[PDB]
């Protein structure tokens, strides 16, 4: 009788596939043929923030796009002022191993994460004047790979057991819980709206939740190997992952389906983060052979190369407004250019 | 040295066109001792990644070659190639005594760098908390002092001199220019801090590192096998005899001079001093560029025309 | 502009105090040496760990005034590609291994085959593997009670003999003892096989209960940051 | 979509021959170490062979080699098992894996019990 259910199964994937291919009546690269290209992209470091111990792993931009904080190996989770380069706290974890790193949008908390399988939120600006954990959220039996804020009390996190959870940090239970992966989940990204969220993960397939009501909404199965990053269009209706396949591919929510892709013969690296601009034109790309690059997202031609790290681009992250980018390295530093 | 009334200045006794030559490669080592130098103080500092604190004894060993090369050695490639001084006479007390000064700088910073891999090959667990950045920089402290007060209360106090006689102190001038003297206790003494000290450091240290390099060769070979004899003796050959056949003609011609109340014609004055100043030249390309990492680090510098393999996209 | 500058002297003040922290803890984790204590199943991991004395348990303790870590990775599932990256700045990795469980599935070739995983990954290259083998009095109890059958089920058992440069601590006759070096000829030929010179395999193949278990550990981590040194310094 | 379907497989009495095909699409084969590995009725997941990006490296489980033989064509997609010989020991589910990641002698998770990149299987039963 299983067999019975496995053609089904089948046959339904046929119809979405079918589904897919009549609505595919031309690809990106068509319509865009007749545009103007983006030119090269000459941009240099001009910041680089040091004072971190061992290889930085993550990092987040306040929604001010001035403060930054960054999470490292150390056991060290230090915000930054980018702008004057000082170091407006410097947090020290319980766990040496912090995976993830989250500035709430208000700016008052923090939140990280790792090997622990715990999510820590950090009070920046108690009454006393110092940080202390304002709750541990725990019930995941992974390992968190990426955190992030709805709100200063809802908490989205991403773990290595293969689900995804909504805490309500107020009272630390799950408020919802997604289960749809089946491999590991290293990475997120919200909808500027909030009502949505993609999850990459390990088996090679991207996933399009639903916060509240909490089941996946759409499964992208375009890839071929391990989901490292994940990140939206400004506008919410499409985004990019980057997979250790050294491709990146941008998808559609509302196509369903892959728009494009991004990759290069002398590429066989894997990649480790992407983000956009704030008006989706560049993906910028983070590769593990010491570098990134910078995709014009709708020519899929390299329009640029950001080569001033030494061992990994571990993260990497544009502001709000657009005016910086900011790639933390394995080798401790960060290097903010624009 | 038989000391005169009127000083010949003219015994240049020598070709235009070969004291020319002579010229051309004394500045040549000199440009060669400025640039090799500045590339291992400048990039050493630059690079973010070539900050730990072994690093900052071969940034502050290039920086007393630097000087050296600066504001030293074009003062005795006159002396040399003129014999006859041409820059007065306070000017070269303070030139005879910055001269050691920078050498016994140099020196030391070599038997420290021989300290620093001792504690490193020796001492591994404990090495990163011993060789702090506090330890280092009172090493580069001592070093950078000790030869100072050592040559400036020694030269100008003319301390050398004291203990000798003036009648051959006098006449050690032959003409005076700045052919330094040095007496027998103040030849020894000299020897023993600026050389025999740091060279039998140097030596006691380096056996040792030898020495347990070729038994981890042998466990290594023994283990895994289902090199010029080693990597460490290539690489300590260089090391250490760029240093002896650098310095140690000098030093030997240096304090056997007093006690044999030898002469020592000129010429061979001239080549063992610059044999010590190519060691100078040569510190740079045997601490900082004949290890790879430097070398990677400076390809790196230069990145507007070279591009990565990254990993030479290796594949089975 | 006043009010710029008294909040530019409160945040390098604030700076200040930061910096100062944390050189005090770069002092402070410069001289600490971090492990990882891979557990491929129920080899070991229970006993052992109690003589180097809810995700990464993290132990300290302190071998002749040296401050080891050790990260006793546990809740992880079974699927490490992704989490065995990150400790690619380990000194070592203890490998912990059941060498009496060749003939009871097979926890010698899940952890034989973990071992060369390890090995080629392309960000442990540089991560050296400190490897116990727990078990080794039940492994050499077995093959005197007749219970090997490893010349069946690692058929490649006829042409070995015990190295004549063998090292056979008493009540280990010659047969047995084939079995315990028989388990050291097979991660020692992954060792050999693959091959760069930047990292290194150290077996001690020891029972389940001994003092001379951290003495090893620190033994060789000894020897790894030797090695290290000297191979950076381009030395050997 | 990365898909992996195995054919060949049922009874075969002891001493019988057998072949296993594993047809994988949705990726690039011929980047890929493609491994073989069993579940024993009751037991865990063991593996059983390997083949490396061209077919140049091999390597079998100790109580196989000589008795079965992998090889793969990269043309065509496919990977195959040879199965000569048999014992009733080696009735078992099989199962066509890829290892995660392309360019890598690695093969880290291909015998856990949730990879994503392994197919369903076939029985193969071993008795008379």
């Known amino acids: 009788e299983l067999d019975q259910l496995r053609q089904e199964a089948e046959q339904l994937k046929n119809q979405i596939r079918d589904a897919r291919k009549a609505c595919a009546d031309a690809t990106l690269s068509q319509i865009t043929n007749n545009i103007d290209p983006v030119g090269r992209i000459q941009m240099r470091t001009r910041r680089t923030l040091r004072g971190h111990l061992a290889k930085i792993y993550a990092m987040h931009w306040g929604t001010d796009s001035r403060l930054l904080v960054s999470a490292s190996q150390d056991g060290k989770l230090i915000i930054w002022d980018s702008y004057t380069t000082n170091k407006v706290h410097a947090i020290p974890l319980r766990s040496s191993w912090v995976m993830t790193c989250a500035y709430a949008p208000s700016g008052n908390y923090v939140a990280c994460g790792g090997l622990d399988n715990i999510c820590s939120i950090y009070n920046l600006k108690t009454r006393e004047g110092n940080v202390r954990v304002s709750r541990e959220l725990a019930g995941h039996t992974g390992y968190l790979s990426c955190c992030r804020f709805l709100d200063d009390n809802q908490i989205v996190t991403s773990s290595g057991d293969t689900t995804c959870a909504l805490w309500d940090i107020e009272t630390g239970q799950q408020t919802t819980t997604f289960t749809g992966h089946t491999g590991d989940v290293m990475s997120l990204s919200l909808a500027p709206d909030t009502r949505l969220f993609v999850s990459g993960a390990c088996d090679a397939s991207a996933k399009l939740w639903d916060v509240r009501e909490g089941m996946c909404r759409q499964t992208f199965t375009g890839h071929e190997s391990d989901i490292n990053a994940i990140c939206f269009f400004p506008n919410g209706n499409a985004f990019a992952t980057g997979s250790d396949d050294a491709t990146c591919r941008l998808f559609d929510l509302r196509a369903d389906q892959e728009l494009m892709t991004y990759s290069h013969d002398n590429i066989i690296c894997g990649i480790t983060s992407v983000s956009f601009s704030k008006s989706g034109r560049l993906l910028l790309a983070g590769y593990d052979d010491f570098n990134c690059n910078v995709w014009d997202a709708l020519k899929a031609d390299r329009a640029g190369v950001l080569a001033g790290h030494d061992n990994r681009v571990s993260c990497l992250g544009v502001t709000d407004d657009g005016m910086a980018v900011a790639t933390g390295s394995w080798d401790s530093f960060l290097k903010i250019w624009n | 040295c038989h000391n005169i009334i009127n000083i010949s200045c003219v015994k240049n006794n020598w070709s235009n066109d070969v004291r020319a030559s002579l010229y051309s490669l004394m500045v040549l080592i000199i440009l060669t001792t400025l640039v090799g130098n500045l590339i291992v103080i400048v990039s050493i500092s630059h690079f973010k990644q070539l900050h730990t604190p072994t690093n900052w004894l071969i940034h502050s060993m290039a920086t007393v070659d630097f000087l050296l090369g600066c504001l030293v050695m074009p003062y005795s490639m006159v002396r040399s190639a003129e014999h006859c001084w041409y820059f007065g006479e306070v000017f070269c007390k303070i030139h005879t005594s910055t001269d050691i000064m920078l050498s016994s700088a140099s020196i030391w910073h070599l038997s420290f760098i021989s300290i620093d891999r001792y504690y490193a090959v020796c001492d591994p667990l404990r090495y990163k908390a011993k060789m702090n950045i506090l330890v280092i920089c009172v090493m580069i402290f001592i070093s950078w002092s000790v030869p100072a007060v050592f040559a400036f209360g020694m030269i100008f106090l003319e301390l050398n001199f004291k203990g000798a006689e003036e009648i051959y102190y006098k006449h050690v001038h032959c003409r005076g220019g700045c052919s330094v003297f040095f007496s027998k206790i103040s030849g020894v003494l000299t020897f023993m801090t600026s050389f025999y000290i740091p060279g039998s450091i140097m030596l006691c240290v380096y056996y040792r590192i030898y020495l347990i390099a070729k038994e981890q060769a042998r466990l290594i070979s023994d283990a895994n096998q289902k090199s010029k004899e080693r990597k460490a003796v290539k690489t300590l050959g260089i090391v250490m005899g760029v240093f002896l056949i650098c310095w140690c003609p000098f030093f030997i011609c240096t304090v056997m001079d007093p006690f044999l109340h030898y002469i020592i014609p000129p010429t061979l004055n001239d080549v063992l001093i610059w044999f010590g100043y190519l060691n100078s030249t040569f510190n740079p390309m045997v601490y900082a560029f004949f290890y790879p990492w430097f070398r990677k680090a400076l390809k790196m510098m230069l990145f507007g025309k070279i591009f990565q393999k990254d990993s030479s996209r290796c594949k089975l | 502009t006043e009010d710029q500058r008294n909040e530019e002297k409160a945040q390098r003040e604030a700076n200040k105090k930061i910096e100062k922290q944390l050189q005090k803890d770069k002092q402070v984790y410069r001289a600490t040496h971090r492990l990882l204590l891979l557990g491929a199943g129920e080899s070991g991991k229970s006993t052992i760990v109690k003589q180097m004395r809810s995700g990464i348990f993290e132990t300290k303790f302190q071998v002749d005034k040296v401050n080891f870590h050790m990260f006793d990775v546990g809740a992880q599932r079974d699927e490490r590609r992704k989490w065995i990256q990150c400790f690619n700045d380990v000194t070592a990795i203890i490998f912990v291994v059941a060498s009496s469980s060749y003939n009871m599935t097979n926890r010698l070739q899940e952890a034989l085959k973990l071992f060369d995983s390890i090995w080629n990954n392309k960000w442990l290259r540089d991560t050296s593997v400190i490897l116990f083998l727990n078990k080794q009095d039940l492994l050499a109890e077995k093959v005197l009670a007749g219970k090997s059958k490893i010349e069946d089920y690692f058929p490649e058992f006829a042409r070995y003999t015990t190295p004549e440069d063998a090292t056979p601590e008493p009540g280990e006759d010659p047969r047995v003892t084939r079995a315990k070096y028989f388990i050291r000829d097979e991660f020692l030929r992954i060792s050999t096989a693959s091959g760069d010179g930047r990292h290194y395999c150290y077996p001690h193949f020891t029972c389940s209960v001994d003092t001379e278990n951290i003495r090893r550990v620190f033994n060789d981590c000894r020897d790894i940051i030797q090695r290290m040194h000297l191979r950076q310094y381009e030395l050997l | 979509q990365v898909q992996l379907q195995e054919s060949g497989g049922g009874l075969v009495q002891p001493g019988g021959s057998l072949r296993l095909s594993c047809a994988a699409s949705?990726?690039?084969?011929?980047?890929?170490?493609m491994n073989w590995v069993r579940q024993a009725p009751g037991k865990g997941l063991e593996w059983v062979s390997d083949?490396?990006?061209?077919?140049?490296?091999?390597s079998y489980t100790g109580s196989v080699k000589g008795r079965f033989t992998i090889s793969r064509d990269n043309a065509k997609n496919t990977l195959y098992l040879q199965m000569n010989s048999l014992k009733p020991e080696d009735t078992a589910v099989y199962y066509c894996?890829?290892?995660?990641?392309?360019?890598?002698?690695?093969?880290?998770?291909?015998?856990?019990?949730?990879?994503?990149?392994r197919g369903q299987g076939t029985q193969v039963t071993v008795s008379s």
């Open positions: 083949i490396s990006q061209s077919g140049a490296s091999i």
């Open positions: 949705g990726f690039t084969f011929s980047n890929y170490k």
């Open positions: 894996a890829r290892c995660p990641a392309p360019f890598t002698r690695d093969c880290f998770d291909v015998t856990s019990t949730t990879y994503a990149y």
